[PDB]
């Protein structure tokens, strides 16, 4: 999936908020590499995307 | 005179008020109290105090 960098934070075993409570929950004992790059060259547009 | 009586009574006593002030303590953790640890702490900082 895509999100704000910002975010990112939130993709992390047992994390609150709204990218973690209301869009995508790990698990607490989550076994997984999390895997992370800026996409602004792919999907970001002159008056937004 | 029954001293030894006495003694065997006092000795369960205190075992048993040192056991229940125990409770008190904080063995380092941030509180003693496991509702205040859980209003203060996310998920995972709460787990481990």
Known sequence: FV???DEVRQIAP???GKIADYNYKLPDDFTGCV????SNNLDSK???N | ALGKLQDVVNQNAQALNTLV???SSNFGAIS???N???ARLD???AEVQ
């Not at chain 1, 895997?35 to 800026?38: G, H, P, T, V």
Request: charged share 20%; proline share 0%; net charge positive.
């Open chain 2, 43 to 45: 998920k995972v900082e």
């Open chain 1, 35 to 38: 895997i992370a790059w800026n």
């Open chain 2, 32 to 34: 003693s109290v496991l």
């Open chain 2, 36 to 38: 205040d640890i859980l």
């Open chain 2, 21 to 23: 002030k125990q409770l």
């Open chain 1, 14 to 16: 047992g994390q609150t």
């Open chain 1, 46 to 48: 002159v008056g937004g």
């Open chain 1, 3 to 5: 999100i704000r960098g």
